[PDB]
């Protein structure tokens, strides 16, 4: 709120190996531009590099419940069978 008003007012009125952390962008006041919503990719796509189990633990759990709701008992038991495999 204070930083928002300051933003409006501003708008309208040696060998260094490491990068200086003052060169960084991304320090916003808008909470929509700091706490972005993370893509879930239908709960079946993941990110490159990172450990798969970590992502599977840290995902938003929306689609797990949406399966548990929509999935019928036959599809539920088939999914459980693959899970146990």
């Amino acid at each position: 709120k204070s930083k928002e008003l300051h933003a409006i007012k501003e708008r309208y009125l040696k060998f260094v190996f490491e990068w200086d952390a003052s060169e960084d962008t991304s320090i916003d006041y808008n909470p929509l531009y700091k706490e972005r919503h993370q893509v879930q990719l239908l709960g079946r796509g993941f990110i490159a590099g990172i450990d798969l189990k970590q992502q599977k633990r840290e995902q938003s759990r929306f689609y797990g419940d949406l399966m548990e709701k929509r999935r019928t008992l036959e599809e539920k038991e088939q999914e459980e069978a693959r899970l146990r495999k």
Binding site: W19, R44, L66, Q78
Partner: protein, 105 residues
């Protein structure tokens, strides 16, 4: 336009299968009468009828349409080993939240 490619999870499911991620279709015609004298001749059948609908590599070969290049290819020209960045699509992604400032810079 958003791609709605429903990624497959079981190899033991039909390739064409109404996934639970897909919102259900809530069910609910100048047709002629059955007594109308239209007969389909003896040697007439749907076009590919002995051909099975899906094969054991139809689910996998559709997933290859939505693959990143070079995996959405099936032929091409070789590159040099040094001309292939393996992490150039890693840092073209959004700057990850929660990493220390050194990583984001």
């Amino acid at each position: 336009p958003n791609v709605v490619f429903i990624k497959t999870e079981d190899p033991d499911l039909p390739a064409f299968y109404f996934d639970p991620l897909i919102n259900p279709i809530s069910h609910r015609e100048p047709l002629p009468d059955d007594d109308e004298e239209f007969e389909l001749p003896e040697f007439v059948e749907p076009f590919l009828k002995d051909t099975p609908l899906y094969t054991d590599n139809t689910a996998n070969g559709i997933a290859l349409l939505w693959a990143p290049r070079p995996f959405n290819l099936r032929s091409g020209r070789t590159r040099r080993a040094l001309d292939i960045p393996l992490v150039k699509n890693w840092y073209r992604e959004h700057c990850p939240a929660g990493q220390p400032v050194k990583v984001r810079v």
